[PDB]
Every structure is written in C-alpha cells, then in structure tokens.
C-alpha cells in the first residue's frame, strides 16, 4: 500500500525487445502559465527519492542563467502519493529558504528515520568546483522532515553545525550528488574531494590505450581535474556521517576504488532489491554509462556494468560512443535506476543525439541492447540534466524523472516532472 522502495519480488515485467510504443510517460509538473518575460532561470536542480519521501532543490537566477544574481534558494521535502489515477505525484510538505541564496551550492539528501538530511556547501567565493583554491571548506546540514508538528519547538528548521571534517589525505570535501543511502545509524552522501594534483598516484598503465592510436597515453593522468592546469582534482566518493556517535556527529570521507577511475562528478547511490547500486555521472572521457553494484562500503568497491549501448552527448569534442581517453570535462547528468537484478535492466532518461543535448528519451535497456524507448518531447527540445528514480506503487513499478526540457510555452529551460509506467506484459 502506498509508495514503497524496491524490496522483494515485484510483478514480472516484459523481457523482450519491442518497439510498438509500449511506454507512455505522463507529466506531473503543470507549471503556471507565466506571461511576458521570465527572468527567473532555474538552475542547479535536485531530485532525491527514498522510501516514498522526495526532496527538491533549485536556484532561481534573475536575467541570464550562467551569470545571474540569485533570488530564492528553495529546499523542499514531501511525500510521494497518488494523483487519483494510479499515477504517482510529488506532494511537497515543507519548504525552506536559507538567508543568503548566493552561498548555498551543491546540496544533497538522505532519509534515515524521519529526517530528510540536506547537505549543502557554503561558499563565499563562487561555485565550489569552479573556485576550489579559495573556498573555505565549511559544510551546511539541515534537518528537514515531514509533519513538523507546528505546536512544538525547533522540529522544522534545525541546521546541524558540523564541528570539523576529518580527511584522511584530502584537503577539501564537498557534497556533489542528489541522493545517497542509509544504513541505520550511518548516512552516506555522494560527494567529491578536491585532492592535490601534485600528490596523486596513478600509474600510466591502466589507461585504456588498447586501440587509441590518435589518442595520447598521457591523457588519463591529466583528466581528473576541471582544467588541465588545475591545482585540485575531483576524486568522487562518499561522505560518512555518524549521527549516532559522539555529542555532535562528525563527517569522514571514503574514496572510490581505483577500478575504472574517472573524474569526480554528481553521483548517486541508491538501494535496490536489497543491495545498493552506485552511479557516477560521465563527466570525463568515459562517455559510456558508469554504474555497478557496490560490494564493500568502507573501501567503496563498485563493480561497473560494461554497457556499450547507452552513452552521453558532448560538445562536438567528446561525442557519444567514445571510449579512448580525451581531455574533455563536458557532459550532462543522466542516471539509470536498476529495475531488476536477476537480468540487468536499467531505466533512465538519456539523450539520443550525438550532438548538442536534444531529444530526451526514457530508455529501459539491458546489458548490451536497447529494450524500450519512449519519446516524451520533440527532437528539437533541449535538455540540460536528467534525474530518474524508480519505485514501487501499490503493486506496479513507476519511475519519476526530473528533466530540464525547453518549455516552449514559457521560452525557458524549465525542470519538468515525468512519470513512466514499466510495461507489465509485452502483449
């Protein structure tokens, strides 16, 4: 009953490649018909769904989108319920706004027992990944919940002040990821550390230089940074938060294993049919999708499923279906939620265009094939970031996706919500 996570044995779905338009995505984000100009460009989205509780974060910039003053930083939490037609909807229950909107960047979310912990970064010099040699390093953590019990004390806004961050050998850590996992008394936020470039160990042998005659063998080393001549490289990983030990909890960092290592990017680890699956956004030469099963937690070993049918578009320098190393920190976030693990199938909103990001399509694909595709927008609609999270309805499976489509009705890149029903039977 209600909205639950993937735990157990759901209804069997179609296991055959079909293309007779078996998918029909609906929209659950009917926006107000704004008239005239907008000047309210929505950047930095966030969508984290866990145990029927969803979180949302977006920044409204006045004027342009890249260079625009911030107006309101909305951090919202809510429950996932039905829309009266067996279609899930996002009923946001609480909304908060920090005092300074131009200082909150790269938030996160996790739900352990009754709190939706939002882990953002405090920056007074600009963007964290853009300005790394001048960022302070302090992190912000807010305890948002559902049903704050108005006739009470501070159980609606409490912002936990982190004492100090204990880094093993890193300099600065920052939460870079929509959603993490919970393990009872330990929160795990997908984050990235700004490691010193002059103190990184990576032998120039593990680089995939099998058939890369046009490429250069020294491309793997100078690729984990935002720029070639950069002082801080992005090492993805997790932030462990022990809210059950000590008077005030602490934060530690655990890096990702060296197996198929890439640059730090918005990552997401999510539980499924038991174990957690980790996905790292392909913001590097590895245009192929990077996701796999997590074996261990402390050393963070994640086996990556080699998928060669789904890729990520670029900017005419590192297009889709590219494997050889190349210096290009250009990409978009396109996750893929694992549906069933008996046969590896993942559903995600990707971009079927080896060019500028256009034509978002919801693809449910197996290891190496394209099982089902759904076209939810015209081939001219532009996208910027796609987040997808699947869950269990009363008895079926439904996937909610936030897509940065070009709203033709308002002439602005607007985050819209879409609900996709997994086909139960091919017939």
């Amino acid at each position, epitope marked *: 009953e209600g909205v639950s996570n993937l735990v157990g044995l759901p209804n069997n779905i179609c296991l055959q490649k079909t293309s007779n338009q078996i998918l029909k995505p609906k929209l659950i*984000s009917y926006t*107000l018909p704004v008239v005239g100009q907008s000047g309210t460009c929505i950047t930095d989205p966030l969508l984290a769904m866990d145990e029927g509780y969803f979180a949302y974060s977006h920044l*409204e910039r006045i004027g342009s989108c890249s260079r625009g003053v911030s*107006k309101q930083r*909305i951090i919202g939490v809510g429950e996932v*319920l039905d829309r*009266g037609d067996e279609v899930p909807s*996002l*009923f946001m229950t609480n*909304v908060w706004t920090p005092p300074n909107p131009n200082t909150v960047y790269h938030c996160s979310a996790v739900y352990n027992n009754e709190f939706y912990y939002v882990l953002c970064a405090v920056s007074t010099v600009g963007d964290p990944i853009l300005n790394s040699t001048y960022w302070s390093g302090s992190l912000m953590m807010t305890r948002l919940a559902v049903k704050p019990k108005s006739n009470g004390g501070g159980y609606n806004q409490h912002q936990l002040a982190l004492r100090s961050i204990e880094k093993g050998r890193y300099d600065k850590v920052m939460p870079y990821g929509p959603s993490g996992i919970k393990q009872g008394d330990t929160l795990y936020f997908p984050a990235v550390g700004f490691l010193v470039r002059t103190e990184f160990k990576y032998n120039d042998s593990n680089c995939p230089i099998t058939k890369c005659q046009y490429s250069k063998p020294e491309n793997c080393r100078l690729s984990m940074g935002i720029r070639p001549n950069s002082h801080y490289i992005l090492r993805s990983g997790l932030l462990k938060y022990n809210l059950s030990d000590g008077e005030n909890p602490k934060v530690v960092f655990i890096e990702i294993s060296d197996q198929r290592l890439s640059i730090g990017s918005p990552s997401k680890i999510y539980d499924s049919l038991g174990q957690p699956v980790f996905y790292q956004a392909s913001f590097s030469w590895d245009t192929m999708i990077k996701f796999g099963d997590v074996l261990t937690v402390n050393p963070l070993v994640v086996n990556w499923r080699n998928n060669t049918v789904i890729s990520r578009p670029g900017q005419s320098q590192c297009p889709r279906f590219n494997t050889c190393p190349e210096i290009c920190w250009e990409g978009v976030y396109n996750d893929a939620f694992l549906i069933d693990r008996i046969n590896w199938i993942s559903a995600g909103v990707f971009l079927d265009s080896n060019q500028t990001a256009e034509n978002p399509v919801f693809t449910v694909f197996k290891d190496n094939e394209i099982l089902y595709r759904a076209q939810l927008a015209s081939e001219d609609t532009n996208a910027q970031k796609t987040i997808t999270n699947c869950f269990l309805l009363k008895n079926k499976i439904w996937c909610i996706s936030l897509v940065e489509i070009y709203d033709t009705g308002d002439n602005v890149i607007r985050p819209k919500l879409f609900a996709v029903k997994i086909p139960e039977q091919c017939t």
Partner: nanobody
Amino acid sequence: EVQLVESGGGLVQPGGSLRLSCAASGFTFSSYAMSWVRQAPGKGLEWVSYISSSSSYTNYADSVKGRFTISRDNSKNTLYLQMNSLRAEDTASYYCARGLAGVWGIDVWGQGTLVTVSS
C-alpha cells in the same frame, strides 16, 4: 478530470479584509495538501499558506505571519483564505493548488482570481 476554481475579487482599499474561496472537483479533497500560491504581475510564485490533512500542522508564510489565515473543510470541498489587514504589497492573483510551492504543479492550475489593493 480535475477542476480547481478560484473565486473572489479585488479592487480594495489598503487595510481591510477579504474572504476568498476555492473549489475542488475530481480528486479527494480530504487527503491532499491543497495549499495557496500567489502570483504578482512581473514576479514569480510566492507561497502564502500551506494546509495539511486534519489540523496537525499549518505554515503561515512567515513573511506575512498575522495577515493571512488559511482554513480547510472536508465536508464541503472549499478552501478558505480569509485575509485580515491587507496591504498594497498583496496585489496579486491567488491559486488554490495541490502541493506547497515551487515549480511543481500536480494538476491544471485554472483561471484563478485577481486581487487588487489601491485607492
């Protein structure tokens, strides 16, 4: 399908009262949020009141704490937004929609109602 009508008018003198009303057809009104949102000409969406199910929690949009008071009724589907001591900074349009605030819209918004504070 789903119908949400926003009645009421405007053209009021700064300082007074206003009794807004809402309509609901389709979905169940007793089990959903059905909050209010405000849209000023030239500005974006501004949340003014959020009501949950049977009275447990009510957020009154701290920016305007004591000027507004939202009320719900499960017997007759109608969401009241009785305003008290309005000002000239409240000239905008009100919409009773599912979901607290932001950019998320569950169902179709609808026509709405215009409220003007002048003279």
